[PDB]
Design a protein around this ligand. Structure first.
Ligand SMILES: [Cd+2]
Ligand SMILES: [Cd+2]
Ligand SMILES: [Cd+2]
Length: 28
């Protein structure tokens, strides 16, 4: 799954094949 630990989503985000954040830049 989204390996980007910089992501702070909750059970619901489709961060499976559409990540768009960097290391210290999460704007989901
Ligand atoms: Cd994110
Ligand atoms: Cd997400
Ligand atoms: Cd992500």
């Amino acid at each position: 799954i989204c390996t980007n630990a910089a992501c702070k989503c909750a059970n619901g985000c489709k961060c499976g094949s559409g990540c768009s954040c960097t290391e210290g830049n999460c704007a989901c």
